[PDB]
Amino acid sequence: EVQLVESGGGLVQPGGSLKLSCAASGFTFSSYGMSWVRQTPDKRLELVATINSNGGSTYYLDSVKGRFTISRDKAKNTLYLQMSSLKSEDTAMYYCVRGGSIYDGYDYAMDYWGQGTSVTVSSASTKGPSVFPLAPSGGTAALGCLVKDYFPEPVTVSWNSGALTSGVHTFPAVLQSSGLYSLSSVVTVPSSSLGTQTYICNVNHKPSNTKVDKKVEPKSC
Amino acid sequence: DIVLTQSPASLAVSLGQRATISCRASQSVSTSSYSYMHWFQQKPGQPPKLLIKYASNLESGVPARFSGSGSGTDFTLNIHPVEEEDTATYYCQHSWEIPLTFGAGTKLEIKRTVAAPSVFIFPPSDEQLKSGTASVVCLLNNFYPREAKVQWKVDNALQSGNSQESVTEQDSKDSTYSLSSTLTLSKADYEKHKVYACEVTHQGLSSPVTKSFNRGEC
């Protein structure tokens, strides 16, 4: 199985520096050209850089020339993107991609993409979220977790540690009037299960090193 | 540099019917032997996935309902029969020359039967209230089509400019949407009022659905 795992993204100040890493497995890394493709908040895809299989040929998007360097380490089967003099325009999801190389007389398509690593270029300070319960007749009840006032994106939410996935909706975050984000995660269940089954949301904001498990119970009254 | 123009920007296709998405390149990307055009699917919360390479080659392991055609400047992605899991944004991309570029994407909605929203209202937690703010949440669960109207009434007064909505991407299994509306007040403003109501309309509801609570009630 081909695997591409990005790391190194996060919040960085304008003019600042980050180094993205992509650990490749499941194929002969040295046999393939590799690319970084970014997705901006408008959902446009743009190729940022390509490196051929051996590392002797590189392409850069005009707007990142002299700022970004793509490289690879054969020892570690690892692809890198050094990002310097970071600008607002560089805020995006960065995907590690097998292929996108048309060097050396061979065309290799973009056939495998990693889950991506988020970059947010901003002078604003990290803020961890508050997590509040959303607490419930017709056979079906709803409950949830309000994940309030965090920066930057993203937050992840699981239920009952990954054992409850059925009927879960974790909403896209909203940007509030304050420039902090907020989301809700909800789940529907049998009305009858309230009291019987335990329901806990598991909230993770890596940029603030905030992890919160919140028991969500209906009010005794 | 090559520009790729997709059409349409969005479309809805009934379950079991054909989705046809077009990509036009600003110049030919074909020799007489190969066409240097590719197609990707991006499902909600996922990276792009390669569907078709070199215009017509089904990417190994991709289902046979997906096909690509065309040569020169004009390419098509056909999906037939569409299934629920095909809700996604689709992109074209060429590999003719440096720079490699992408089309701006085509959003495919899978059209299903009408489903009215299930409505739920949540009071602010005592814990949030203590801290000085009240977030009131109204949930519209598992409805189709996407258009809905949510109005906040606080003691029978329509609210303005103190609510925000979030809408999920279409569900990959049941083709529905869900929507949250969040009313945000100061502790102080929240406690000046009794009745908190979410009033919902949708084309699948014969009359508005109201969910409400009285501040302090069990």
């Binding site: 065309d107 | 240097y36 390479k53 020359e97």
Partner: peptide, 10 residues
């Protein structure tokens, strides 16, 4: 996995 186009680089 195809021969590069005539417009492809070195």
């Amino acid at each position: 996995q195809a021969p590069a186009s005539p417009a492809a680089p070195a």
